[PDB]
Write a protein that binds this ligand. Structure first.
Ligand SMILES: Nc1ncnc2c1ncn2[C@@H]1O[C@H](COP(=O)(O)OP(=O)(O)O)[C@@H](O)[C@H]1O
Ligand SMILES: Nc1ncnc2c1ncn2[C@@H]1O[C@H](COP(=O)(O)OP(=O)(O)O)[C@@H](O)[C@H]1O
Ligand code: SF4
Ligand code: SF4
Ligand SMILES: [Mg+2]
Ligand SMILES: [Mg+2]
Lengths: 273, 273
């Protein structure tokens, strides 16, 4: 068995930093993990690979001829803790549909046998500002059974969480895609933990972890590393280890209850944000 | 003559607050303005209308039958300073293409004669996290000659500015869409103004204004108002008046020079952000 898991959220909220650090903690635990980057920014694997980024399936298929000319062993790259890494890529701005590379990438990985019996987790790191095209494919096509949404007390971040939840509800008649939790990536504001707990309760899920704001993240990323690898003794490393443990142990996977904009504003007003 | 102008930027960066306050300052000056909301969040006109939001063209067309059953005089709504307001709307998450309502809305406004000779400015408030579908239409179809990008010292915000600039370059062989400036919406960090000035220079444009972070914005928006209307004596009101004056006077409209990710990282490292 392998758990297929997707991290969604608005741009800049912390998806890639949280995913790579969570996955490094899982690898440190002994888990076998693959990360699939599903964001056109295409830097979702750089901290595992010690790299600038990673060349994308779209780019390598263009140089090889067709995606069928690619070999899986040439595409997947392994970094810290044996974590396997791939990036979808996407068309240039103003060309096509920004999510089209996600569809190509996931289908290629499935056909070529990337989902080996020994994997324990797959994490898709998915752009969440719009829920359409290839960005909706992990939900629409039943690729990620467990959705975790990174958010913060920011109204735009909560709105994105609600919109992703609406997408999960829309496709709940087939497949098994469920909301697994909210991850609060702190903005260092008062009552932010209480706010995200309250939002999670309204949606029917949980806050699985509150990740503090900590400059050690910037120091590790300047060096192209997760905090887990950069400073295994850091307080923040223990935070990502706590998140990883709770993901491993989580059994709450729900069809969420999306809320109104009125309810979002009321949450913001209540907790004096 | 009327100047057609579009405000782009990543989600949550300040597009709608900046646009509505800029436009209120223009109206206070004596200009006739229309705002066209091109973001599925659909709250781009609420501060002009004193409202929760505004019902969208997509919603009103569905209740009327077809978009052709709608009358322009039923759709456009006027608020503070006579500013005219409309919202595109868009499909629900997981359905279709998130930008499809923008195409319907702009075509409807053009066919029904909304671009009256007496207008001085039209501002489109456009989602900028992806540059595709209806979100690319103002650029691809030559609807907004002057693009202003709201950004901040945040790396994701600068990346979005670069991606929008790539979209402008892609379509520069026809039409007349140009980059008019960057607007820095402050995160209250050191050297942020210098950073955005440097980014603008690399792209070939300018920082047209540095908007400070100021809690009066939240106090005005709780009351469904621009700062211009809520407290005309506020320091922040004068900031939006300065931005409006510089937009009126701006003559620099360029085909930008998009930069590499290496150059973005170097900018961030230089200014110690
Ligand atoms: N807990 C944290 N503490 C400090 N900085 C953080 C934290 N989480 C994210 N960041 C920083 O925030 C920025 C955006 O994070 P990233 O994971 O790239 O966002 P996304 O993938 O959602 O666009 C990065 O510079 C990252 O280093
Ligand atoms: N200069 C500012 N000072 C204080 N708060 C601001 C400022 N600009 C924007 N905000 C707040 O930031 C949040 C997001 O702004 P908004 O214009 O809705 O972003 P967007 O339209 O780009 O998604 C809102 O709560 C808004 O009140
Ligand atoms: S939103 Fe991007 S192409 Fe439909
Ligand atoms: S990105 Fe939204 S539909 Fe193409
Ligand atoms: Mg990312
Ligand atoms: Mg907005």
């Amino acid at each position: 068995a392998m758990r297929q898991c997707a991290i969604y959220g608005k741009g800049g909220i912390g998806k890639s930093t949280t995913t790579q650090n969570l996955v490094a903690a899982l690898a440190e635990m002994g888990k076998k993990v693959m990360i699939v980057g599903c964001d056109p920014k295409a830097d979702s694997t750089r901290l595992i690979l010690h790299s600038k980024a990673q060349n994308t399936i779209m780019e390598m298929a263009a140089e090889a001829g067709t995606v069928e000319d690619l070999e899986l062993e040439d595409v997947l790259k392994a970094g810290y803790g044996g974590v396997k890494c791939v990036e979808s890529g996407g068309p240039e701005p103003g060309v096509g549909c920004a999510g089209r590379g996600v569809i190509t990438a996931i289908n290629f990985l499935e056909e070529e046998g990337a989902y080996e019996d020994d994997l324990d987790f797959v994490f898709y790191d998915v752009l969440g500002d719009v829920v359409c095209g290839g960005f909706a494919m992990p939900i629409r096509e039943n690729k990620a059974q467990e959705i975790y949404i990174v958010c913060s007390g920011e109204m735009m971040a909560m709105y994105a969480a609600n919109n992703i939840s609406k997408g999960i509800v829309k496709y709940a008649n087939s497949g098994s895609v469920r909301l697994g939790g909210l991850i609060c990536n702190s903005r260092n504001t008062d009552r932010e933990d209480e706010l995200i707990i309250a939002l999670a309760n309204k949606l029917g899920t949980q806050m699985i972890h509150f990740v503090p704001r900590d400059n050690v993240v910037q120091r590790a990323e300047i060096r192209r590393m997760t905090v887990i690898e950069y400073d295994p003794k850091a307080k923040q490393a223990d935070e990502y280890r706590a998140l990883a443990r709770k993901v491993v142990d989580n059994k709450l996977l729900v069809i969420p209850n999306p809320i109104t904009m009125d309810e979002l504003e009321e949450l913001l007003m209540e907790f004096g944000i």
